[PDB]
């Protein structure tokens, strides 16, 4: 009830043994009443590292998008080594969403080893189960076996109606995903452990399918963008091997489905200027000049009867003399060019200062023997050259024209494809302009460039007109156990990619959210802009180039920091050699580097002077000892991981304040949230995701099932808890309900339709759906709906939630008017009472933990000891936690070796990985998540609690209690003991 305190463990240890006398009864009682539950106690178990590889093929559905819906790919399996390293080899194949699926090495949900189907953004198939939401559901197939050598799996995705289907060895899989979210791009993905060999058969040259695709399902090789190539790659890496060693990479620039749909400018609506007869006629005539030049240059002639084979020009006259639809076509398109220029910031003009007289308008080619003679050319490029602004203007017009053309094709029903099929309404150019190839860009730009030259000749005066933030900055610091408070230190940083990279020394309390240099903790230098950031921007030195090495040297005794670029010491504006000075020692300093999106860089702390470059230039001469020179093991670095996690609300929060009004008279205990600085200076309001620390767990078996009636009190199974939204807080900005342990949606514009939900339907041999089930990560009801149903509200909205663990349904009731919305959940599910709110008033919300007639309070469900206590209570453990977007994480010392190379045109793209790799995982029971045991080096509270837990184990096992030793062997095994013995870190 109170929580984890090591003093209680010490009390139990004292209870075990006294002055060399072992109380067998006490030891057995403590063991029996503590260990079998395997709850409220840290658990450890060896697991395997799992990696994932995608095919670099991104597809998705959007309104007006230039992409095809149905898709189909295939993966074959060559070799599988089951039960390697004493664990079953993990192998799953499926699809994944770009925004939401981001596996990390170790320390995942459940007990680690996350792969395809361990989150609501991924859907997979392991051979016998359909993996989604970290829940495995068996599926019926003719040959039911795990993925074995010499078997092939065909995966098809239908985006028209959301569906993913699998087929193993031609036998259909009687189960399909459905009704999933379409907010992103779907790409093929395979998750695997060591000792496996798979091969992608992408399509066409990139392997051919063994089995024919289902009708309407195009091969996945037809979705490759023109500017990109088909090649396997990891999903999201934060490190990469290279000739210099481990290169730290930043975030990767992503793509969205809204980029494929084009949004042009409605230039046809713009009213044409009076220029139509003034200069538009001359522009069209100059275009006729260049047209005739094209015909003359080609083998084309001016023959009145149109004969392409004989290359005859229909008009066949120097002057175009074209019929009205022809002449009007030329004039209308010149007018369209004028409309586009007018719609943009440019303004048309005829002020040429009589440049028309100076224009030659004579090509004098003398090669026009046919009737379309006297080819004119103004030599406008010679008369005036195009300015760079004009060239960018040409690019803008070309982009707009392409966008309108694409919109037209989309309206008709065309889709992009790497292979052109006119009968199939597919072309390789429907992709919008920004992703075009340079050849097509030039082909679309040449005519507009000539038109702009004509405009210059005729004198045109046209003149050209939070959550994401965490995904741009990644911080790589050293561990807090490597802090240096004295001496001279040096470390180097090579800029492989130039831009948005800051390197320097930071204090151990460096937060993972605030940018480096914005706070006084980080004394960083940005070499992209040549500015040193300690608390604010200040120019210093010169910007670096590609491959430049910056050496950071720190004088702890002299209280200075010096930055050198390629050996040369960088100077400030005033000429000071040292970037900073008079710096207080304090807690210490640690090397730190931050990289932007798409930026890579090498970090050399100085483990070996041989690999340390430019050391003898400056660092060795003054006496700067390289950082981490004598230590044998490499420095364990900590990277900033952008994964939203729920953490307790700090009491020192300057914006939010959670107060316990528990023990109120004629009122159940409650926790009220208030805004400390509402309506004041620098006050910030934003989405707040709050939850309760302790969950409620449904029963394993769903076997149905004034003064309150005591019999009903004892035999009831329902639970009640309310949330009071205060007067002045708009109910339209609140959401009351429950959340599963897996929830990491830090959306500032959260809406009830943004939740993740996937329906798994398991069918029979006839295709009839025998079972239908839904998986969602949260269940809330919007208070805006209740307030709409019905200025300042002047009333308090008491939304009460009722949950039945016996049957598995939760139903809501707003203020007492009852809510028709209800949710059904699976057995063995733990839910946290949570609310999502946008603060707009001083008093916002109040979590009330109470009871109704014939209804248990939430405390009875939360605590086993008080399961039969009708009186509500708020023990110290129960607390309000808020979602935190960014947290610190530890980089694993070793990573898997995966080869993703294609074997041939027939074999496909072979992915192999055989080097075993394992780690010790520490599991938190209530949160249903695990983390690395080596991460306890900075988590001192958990380290102390686990040390006292081991001491308690030794205490209960003390003095020859062989039965207790055997009981312990179930929890802590020989493999765990030996791995902990060999664990150096």
């Amino acid at each position: 009830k109170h929580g984890r305190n090591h003093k209680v463990l010490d009390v139990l240890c004292s209870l075990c043994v006294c002055n060399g006398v072992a109380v067998r009864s006490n030891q057995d009682l403590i063991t029996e009443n503590l260990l079998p539950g395997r709850e409220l106690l840290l658990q450890t178990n060896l697991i395997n590292y799992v990696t994932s590889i995608r095919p670099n093929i991104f597809v998705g559905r959007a309104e007006g998008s230039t992409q095809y819906g149905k898709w189909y790919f295939e993966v074959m399996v060559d070799e599988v080594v089951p039960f390697l390293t004493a664990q079953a080899t993990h192998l799953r194949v499926g699809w994944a969403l770009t925004e939401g699926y981001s596996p990390y090495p170790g320390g995942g949900e459940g007990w680690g080893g996350n792969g395809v189907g361990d989150d609501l953004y991924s859907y997979g198939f392991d051979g016998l189960h359909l993996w989604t939401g970290h829940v495995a559901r068996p599926v019926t197939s003719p040959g039911q076996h795990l993925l074995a050598p010499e078997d092939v799996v065909s995966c098809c995705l239908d985006l028209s109606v959301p569906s993913i289907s699998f087929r193993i060895n031609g036998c259909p899989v009687q189960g399909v995903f459905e009704a999933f979210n379409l907010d992103g791009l779907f790409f093929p993905v395979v998750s695997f452990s060591a000792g496996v060999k798979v091969r992608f058969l992408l399509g066409g040259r990139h392997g051919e399918f063994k089995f024919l695709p289902p009708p309407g399902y195009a091969p996945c090789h037809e979705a490759v963008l023109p500017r990109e190539r088909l090649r396997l790659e990891p999903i999201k890496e934060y490190r990469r091997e290279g000739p210099r060693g481990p290169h730290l990479v930043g975030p990767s620039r992503c793509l969205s489905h809204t980029d494929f749909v084009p949004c042009p400018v409605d230039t046809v609506q713009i009213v044409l200027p009076p220029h139509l007869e003034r200069i538009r006629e001359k522009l069209a005539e100059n275009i006729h000049e260049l047209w005739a030049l094209t015909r003359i240059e080609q083998g084309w002639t001016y023959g009145p009867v149109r004969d392409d084979n004989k290359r005859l020009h229909p008009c066949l006259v120097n002057f175009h003399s074209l019929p009205e639809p022809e002449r009007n076509y030329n004039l209308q398109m010149s007018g369209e060019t004028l409309k586009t220029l007018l719609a943009l910031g440019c303004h048309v003009g005829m002020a040429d200062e009589k440049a028309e007289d100076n224009l030659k308008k004579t090509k004098l080619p003398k090669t026009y023997m046919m009737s379309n003679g006297y080819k004119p050319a103004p030599l406008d490029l010679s008369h005036v050259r195009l300015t760079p602004a004009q060239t960018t203007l040409v690019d803008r017009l070309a982009e707009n024209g392409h966008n309108v053309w694409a919109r037209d094709r989309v309206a008709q029903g065309w889709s992009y494809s790497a292979v052109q099929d006119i009968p199939a309404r597919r072309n390789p150019r429907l992709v919008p302009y920004r992703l075009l190839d340079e050849a097509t860009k030039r082909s679309n730009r040449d005519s507009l460039c000539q038109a702009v030259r004509t405009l210059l000749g005729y004198g045109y005066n046209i003149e050209p007109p939070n959550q994401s933030r965490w995904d741009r900055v990644r911080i790589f610091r050293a561990e807090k156990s490597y802090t240096v408070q004295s001496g001279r230190w040096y470390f180097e940083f090579e800029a492989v990619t130039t831009g948005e990279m800051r390197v320097g020394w930071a204090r151990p309390e460096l937060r993972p959210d605030v940018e480096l240099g914005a706070d006084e903790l980080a004394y960083v230098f940005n070499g992209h802009r040549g500015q040193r950031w300690h608390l604010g921007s200040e120019p210093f030195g010169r910007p670096w180039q590609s491959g430049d090495v910056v050496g950071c040297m720190i004088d702890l005794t002299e209280n200075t920091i010096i930055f050198t670029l390629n050996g040369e010491v960088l100077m400030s504006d005033s000429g000071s050699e040292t970037a900073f000075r008079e710096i207080e020692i304090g807690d210490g300093f640690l090397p730190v580097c931050s990289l932007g999106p798409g930026q890579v860089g090498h970090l050399n702390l100085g483990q070996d002077v041989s690999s340390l470059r430019f050391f003898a230039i400056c660092g060795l001469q003054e006496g700067f000892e390289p950082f981490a020179i004598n230590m044998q093991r490499p420095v364990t670095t900590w990277f900033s991981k952008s994964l939203p996690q729920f953490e307790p609300v700090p009491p020192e929060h300057p914006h939010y304040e959670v107060a316990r009004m528990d023990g109120t008279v004629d009122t159940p205990p409650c926790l009220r949230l208030a805004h400390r600085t509402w309506g004041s200076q620098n006050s910030l309001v934003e989405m707040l995701f709050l939850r309760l620390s302790l969950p409620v767990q449904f029963h394993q078996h769903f076997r149905c099932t004034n003064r309150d009636d005591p019999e009903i009190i004892l035999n009831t199974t329902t639970y009640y808890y309310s949330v009071r939204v205060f007067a002045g807080q708009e109910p339209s900005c609140v959401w009351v309900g429950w959340v599963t342990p897996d929830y990491h949606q830090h959306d500032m514009n959260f809406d009830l339709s943004k939740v993740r939900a996937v329906t798994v339907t398991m069918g029979d041999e006839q295709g009839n759906v025998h079972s239908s089930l839904k998986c969602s990560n949260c269940y809330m009801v919007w208070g805006g709906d209740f307030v709409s149903p019905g200025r300042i509200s002047h009333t308090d909205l008491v939304i009460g939630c009722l949950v039945d663990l016996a049957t598995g349904l939760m139903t809501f009731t707003a203020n007492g008017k009852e809510s028709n919305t209800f949710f059904q959940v699976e057995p063995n599910t733990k839910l946290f009472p949570a609310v999502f709110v946008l603060p707009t008033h001083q008093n916002v919300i109040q979590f009330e933990l109470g009871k109704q007639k014939n209804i248990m309070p939430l405390s009875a469900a939360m605590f086993l000891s008080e399961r039969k206590n009708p009186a509500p209570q708020c023990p110290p453990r129960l607390e309000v936690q808020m979602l935190m977007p960014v947290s610190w994480s530890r980089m694993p010392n070793h990573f898997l070796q995966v080869e993703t190379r294609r074997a041939g045109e027939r074999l496909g793209w072979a992915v192999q990985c055989q080097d075993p790799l394992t780690m010790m995982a520490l599991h938190i029971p209530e949160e249903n998540r695990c983390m690395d045991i080596l991460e306890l080096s900075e988590r001192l509270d958990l380290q102390r609690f686990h040390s006292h837990t081991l001491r308690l184990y030794r205490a209960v096992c003390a003095l020859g209690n062989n039965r207790v030793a055997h009981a312990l062997c179930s929890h802590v095994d020989q493999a765990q003991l030996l791995h902990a013995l060999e664990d150096a870190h």
Partner: nanobody
Amino acid sequence: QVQLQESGGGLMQAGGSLRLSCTASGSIFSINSMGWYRQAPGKQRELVATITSGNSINYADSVKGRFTISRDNAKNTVYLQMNSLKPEDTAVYYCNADRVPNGYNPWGTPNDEYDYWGQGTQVTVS
């Protein structure tokens, strides 16, 4: 969106009379050069005589037999009449209205490729 409904070209022996009607329903702008093509079963697609506004007809390799093809801009209609027939004339014929006039577009690829295919009909010769 410009949709070119094409109806006609029923089966007939050699020398029969076949009438085909191509109507281009859609925006009146850029309605021109409602030309013709044919795709033979398992063969190459060939350009039939293309008629444009202004009574301009361009002939090509697919002018077998005797076509009489005439278009009216009032209702965007094209009447094609084959009075003779040959065994090699069996194909799926198509009618296309492109903003390209009289087969001319000395301009950007977007303007040139801006086009509107239709449905067509099957012509079979016994």
